[PDB]
């Protein structure tokens, strides 16, 4: 996260870390939508272009973390994957359309003061929260800078970072990339004349873009950290997977009934 802040403890109890076994490394962010399901970005598991193709056994899921590198014995929970589901129409070749994916935990996780699920939006909620100008909140353990002087510092944060960005008008998003954006995406970030900055960055992908409902006091996951052109560049914005439209697929995958 660029130009963010340290999150307070228990600020995003739904924040999940995607850990790689060997080499041990941070793959991506992800969210807890329930007792056994994790929502992440597809490009975190599969991106041929870089020979990226993880399987259920190559990863671990760590829930309830604050510190990036520590092994928080008393607070975090380390889960193994039972099955991974990628959106059948995930387009990693041209625009990363439908960059969404679910992961099924092997055993349900026990909720706590540090581990709690986020809500998924309903039609009306999406309808009234997803409006340009309204602010969202991104969280992660990714790069603090798009680039930096090697060995002179640390590109990564010690604890979970947080940043609040506004939603940008489609037309504005469209005119910022040569890429073909779809109705399955949305962009966020401050504008050049806005006097503020902030963006997600490498490592933050799969992370959740959430919004707070003033009427019910609950947090809703409107998007997933998807892609972007560098980090915190002027006249550029971050692209997020539109969680509301891909909902039927989620519905269909989860099968709660």
């Amino acid at each position: 996260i660029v130009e963010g802040s340290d999150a307070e403890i228990g600020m995003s109890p739904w924040q999940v870390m995607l850990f790689r076994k060997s080499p041990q490394e941070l793959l991506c962010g992800a969210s807890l939508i329930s007792d056994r399901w994790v929502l992440t970005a597809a490009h975190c598991l599969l991106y041929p272009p870089w020979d990226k193709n993880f399987t259920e056994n190559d990863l671990l899921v760590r829930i309830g973390k604050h510190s990036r590198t520590r092994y928080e014995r008393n607070i975090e929970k380390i889960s193994m994957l039972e099955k991974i589901y990628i959106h059948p129409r995930y387009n990693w070749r041209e625009n990363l359309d439908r960059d969404i994916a679910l992961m099924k935990l092997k055993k349900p996780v026990a909720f706590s003061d540090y581990i709690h699920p986020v809500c998924l939006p309903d039609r009306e909620t999406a309808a009234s929260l997803l409006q340009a100008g309204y602010k969202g909140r991104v969280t992660g353990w990714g790069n603090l800078k798009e680039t930096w002087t090697a060995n002179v510092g640390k590109g990564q944060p010690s604890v979970l970072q947080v940043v609040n960005l506004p939603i940008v008008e489609r037309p504005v998003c469209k005119d910022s990339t040569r890429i073909r954006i779809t109705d399955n995406m949305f962009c966020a970030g401050y504008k050049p004349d806005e006097g503020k900055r902030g963006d997600a960055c490498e490592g933050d992908s799969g992370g959740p873009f959430v919004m707070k409902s003033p009427f019910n006091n609950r947090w809703y996951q409107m998007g997933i950290v998807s892609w972007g052109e560098g980090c915190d560049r002027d006249g550029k914005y971050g692209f997020y997977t539109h969680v509301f439209r891909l909902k039927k697929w989620i519905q269909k995958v989860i099968d709660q009934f």
């Binding site: 802040s5 307070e8 403890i9 228990g10 600020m11 109890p13 939508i33 329930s34 007792d35 706590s112 003061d113 540090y114 709690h116 699920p117 986020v118 809500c119 100008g133 309204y134 602010k135 969202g136 909140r137 947080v162 609040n164 506004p166 919004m211 707070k212 409902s213 003033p214 019910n216 006091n217 609950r218 947090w219 809703y220």
Partner: peptide, 29 residues
């Protein structure tokens, strides 16, 4: 049905986080 969206150390304790209001005010502009 299942509860979600309510942070155990925040919403549930009637406390708010440091930059939560920036989100809220962004609605009433």
């Amino acid at each position: 049905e299942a509860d979600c969206g309510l942070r155990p150390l925040f919403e549930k304790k009637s406390l708010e986080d440091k930059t939560e209001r920036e989100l809220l005010e962004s609605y009433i502009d």
